Design a protein around this ligand. Structure first.
Ligand code: NA
Length: 91
DNA sequence: AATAAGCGGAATGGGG
DNA sequence: TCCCCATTCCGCTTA
């Protein structure tokens, strides 16, 4: 099954949900969610995963925080903004 | 207050 | 057994 960080990277590459997520500085790998349209993206993640409950941005961001220590995604000190690692971007 | 983002400990669930 | 990779729940903090 696809990992959350890969799902997000794939969306940014395809542009399928441009009103929910976008690059801020693509060369640096920083990206940001839409305040008003992030829940539709979270819903999509849960449906793709086949999860029992409806996915919310809160639960998706809880999973995102677990990447902080391994490094695939880190929180940036800007509203709704995160950053992929060089390793993730290179693959 | 209302609204919202951000946090993580802990319990629980996936699929090896 | 016991790690993988989350998901779900809850209470708290910060803006
Ligand atoms: Na967030």
């Amino acid at each position: 099954k696809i990992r959350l960080y890969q799902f997000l990277l794939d969306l940014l590459r395809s542009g399928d949900m441009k009103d929910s997520i976008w690059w801020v500085d693509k060369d640096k790998g920083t990206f940001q969610f839409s305040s008003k349209h992030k829940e539709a993206l979270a819903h999509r993640w849960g449906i793709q995963k086949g999860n029992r409950k409806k996915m919310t941005y809160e639960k998706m961001a809880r999973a995102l925080r677990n990447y902080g220590k391994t490094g695939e995604v880190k929180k940036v000190k800007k509203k709704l903004t995160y950053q992929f690692s060089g390793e993730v971007l290179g693959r």
